[PDB]
Amino acid sequence: APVRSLNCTLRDSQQKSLVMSGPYELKALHLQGQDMEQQVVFSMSFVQGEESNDKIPVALGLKEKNLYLSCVLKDDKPTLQLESVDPKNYPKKKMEKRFVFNKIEINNKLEFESAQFPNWYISTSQAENMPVFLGGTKGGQDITDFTMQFVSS
């Protein structure tokens, strides 16, 4: 209850929208028009962590589902996953580190760094219908910057 949330959608800098692939996967694809319906709405929560003018810790859950983006090791590799949680205990202000991302504002765009694995960012691929992932390479050919749209649902 003592958590401030905010509904929104994310679009990568290449203007791709995010959509639920499997029950636990997000995909980024060029979506437009009415078809923009298969687009995911997040509830962004301002949680506890080391706040700053340029870094704001948030948790990213799907709007009315008990599903959260979390960063864990899977094969020794930092990996982004959708994690289901107790729908009674979430969201909360002191989320577990896995669930926390630092939101960074860069040139009217956003980057989400994993608080658990520093310098690892939520990333999308140049190509479409590719899954959203955790990447340890800023710049490069993979996209780590986003734009956010305020919404509601």
Curated annotation (Swiss-Prot):
Keywords: Cytokine, Cytoplasm, Inflammatory response, Lysosome, Mitogen, Pyrogen, Secreted
Conditions for induction: By LPS. Transcription and translation induced by M.tuberculosis and a number of different M.tuberculosis components in macrophages; EsxA is the most potent activator tested (at protein level). In pancreatic islets, release is increased by high glucose treatment. In pancreatic islets and macrophages, release is also increased by endocannabinoid anandamide/AEA.
Tissue: Expressed in activated monocytes/macrophages (at protein level).
Location within or outside the cell: Cytoplasm, Cytosol; Secreted; Lysosome; Secreted, Extracellular exosome
UniProt site positions, description: Important for interaction with integrin: K55, K63, K65, K74, K88
Effect the entry attributes to changing K63E: Suppression of integrin binding. Markedly reduced activity
PTM field: Activation of the IL1B precursor involves a CASP1-catalyzed proteolytic cleavage. Processing and secretion are temporarily associated.
GO terms, biological process: apoptotic process; astrocyte activation; cell-cell signaling; cellular response to interleukin-17; cellular response to lipopolysaccharide; cellular response to mechanical stimulus; cellular response to xenobiotic stimulus; cytokine-mediated signaling pathway
Site (Involved in receptor binding): R4
Motif interval(s): Involved in interaction with TMED10 C-terminus: 112-125
Molecular function GO labels: cytokine activity; integrin binding; interleukin-1 receptor binding; protein domain specific binding
Note: The IL1B production occurs in 2 steps, each being controlled by different stimuli. First, inflammatory signals, such as LPS, stimulate the synthesis and promote the accumulation of cytosolic stores of pro-IL1B (priming). Then additional signals are required for inflammasome assembly, leading to CASP1 activation, pro-IL1B processing and eventually secretion of the active cytokine. IL1B processing and secretion are temporarily associated.
Protein family according to the UniProt entry: Belongs to the IL-1 family.
Main function: Potent pro-inflammatory cytokine. Initially discovered as the major endogenous pyrogen, induces prostaglandin synthesis, neutrophil influx and activation, T-cell activation and cytokine production, B-cell activation and antibody production, and fibroblast proliferation and collagen production. Promotes Th17 differentiation of T-cells. Synergizes with IL12/interleukin-12 to induce IFNG synthesis from T-helper 1 (Th1) cells. Plays a role in angiogenesis by inducing VEGF production synergistically with TNF and IL6.
Subunit structure, as described in the record: Monomer. In its precursor form, weakly interacts with full-length MEFV; the mature cytokine does not interact at all. Interacts with integrins ITGAV:ITGBV and ITGA5:ITGB1; integrin-binding is required for IL1B signaling. Interacts with cargo receptor TMED10; the interaction is direct and is required for the secretion of IL1B mature form. Interacts with HSP90AB1; the interaction facilitates cargo translocation into the ERGIC. Interacts with HSP90B1; the interaction facilitates cargo translocation into the ERGIC.
Protein known as: Interleukin-1 beta
